Design a protein around this ligand. Sequence first.
Ligand SMILES: O=P(O)(O)O[C@H]1[C@H](OP(=O)(O)O)[C@@H](OP(=O)(O)O)[C@H](OP(=O)(O)O)[C@@H](OP(=O)(O)O)[C@H]1OP(=O)(O)O
Lengths: 221, 221
Amino acid sequence: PIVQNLQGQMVHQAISPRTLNAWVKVVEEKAFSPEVIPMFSALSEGATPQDLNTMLNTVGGHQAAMQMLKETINEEAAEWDRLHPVHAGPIAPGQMREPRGSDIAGTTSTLQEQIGWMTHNPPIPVGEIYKRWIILGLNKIVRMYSPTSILDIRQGPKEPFRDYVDRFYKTLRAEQASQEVKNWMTETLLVQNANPDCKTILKALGPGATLEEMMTACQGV
Amino acid sequence: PIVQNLQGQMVHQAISPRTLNAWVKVVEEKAFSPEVIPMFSALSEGATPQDLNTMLNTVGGHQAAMQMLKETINEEAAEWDRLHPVHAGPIAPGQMREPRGSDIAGTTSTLQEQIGWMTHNPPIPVGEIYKRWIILGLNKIVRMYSPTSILDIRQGPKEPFRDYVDRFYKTLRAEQASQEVKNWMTETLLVQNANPDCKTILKALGPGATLEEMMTACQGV
Ligand SMILES: O=P(O)(O)O[C@H]1[C@H](OP(=O)(O)O)[C@@H](OP(=O)(O)O)[C@H](OP(=O)(O)O)[C@@H](OP(=O)(O)O)[C@H]1OP(=O)(O)O
């Protein structure tokens, strides 16, 4: 985080040990359930790339996943570097050097330049692009850790409908696809994969039946 | 048919050989299934009654069918004679005479007469009336040659609903009862005769359901 001192100049503030330990416990306990992404984005609000690096390195276990995240961050940094070629020439006192692909990731940047980049007007959000790369990696990790694809979620012969819907929507949350495909999956795959006992009821209800109506109608079975 | 020559005068043009060939194929191979009527009504596009008789001689091979067709033509001609009593008196020399029930049927008329009748301002259609009588006869023949009654169209244990609906509608179009009985058949007899699973879904769907919703809800069963 970045805060203003008494004089009003921006000063970095280290993350409290409570937040850091909460994030570490979330990563080590939850495996990589899909709710880690919102929790991470809530715990890392307006943080400098050094803070993100601390929040990532501090994790003790799940080292394979952190390695995959390292690979994804490196690929995104290389692509960004290719997109922005270096402008040769001395930097005027009124500006600062343009951050390269690895300057964003914090492997070759000091704290002061990172503070200066996004506190400048107009701002260049190093933190908000680094967090985008990290979240893009976490999406792949979460998708990998989820057991089964959405197309293989099937209600058992005896399973209650509420548990089946819970499994289906957990898997769909873990799924990686655009929003339109997710809407189609919600509309059709839910009815299509049900057990024979509830499939007839769901078809008889109609094509525009809301989730509440389906679950209250299939409550007994 | 009727065409305009190089001098702007309407002149009869004979039916091309392959159109008569197509009609002969329709008569001899379709076994008077309910689709003979649309194909006749297509092949006889704007034909003077001489061409209608030329196409009709093909049915002369079937003794019973031609007898039914001739009886219906004669009955409609008698009704036409009754409803249009011949007026005795002088007529404007710029107008043609009046077509008798045996002159709209091309039995006692010449080609120039029918050309003048059809190419008139306002036109007096003889081809269309003759075609309507022929279609009445063909409706009677198609009804006679039906293979099964509407009450015997029952979906099989595993026949898809689409095939059953197509069979049912073909049989209903052959039998051609009145309109209200047709609506009652479509609404109720269609649901009644279905196989147990589709019957269950259709009953649970509700009463007064359009065909689209029935076929959409009963798609994969
Ligand atoms: O009554 P037909 O002698 O068999 O005439 C047909 C007819 O031509 P017209 O109606 O212009 O006389 C076809 O026209 P369609 O209405 O089917 O389109 C045409 O076929 P094209 O459409 O391909 O022109 C075909 O011509 P073709 O011989 O090139 O197949 C031609 O048959 P004839 O040429 O033997 O008269």
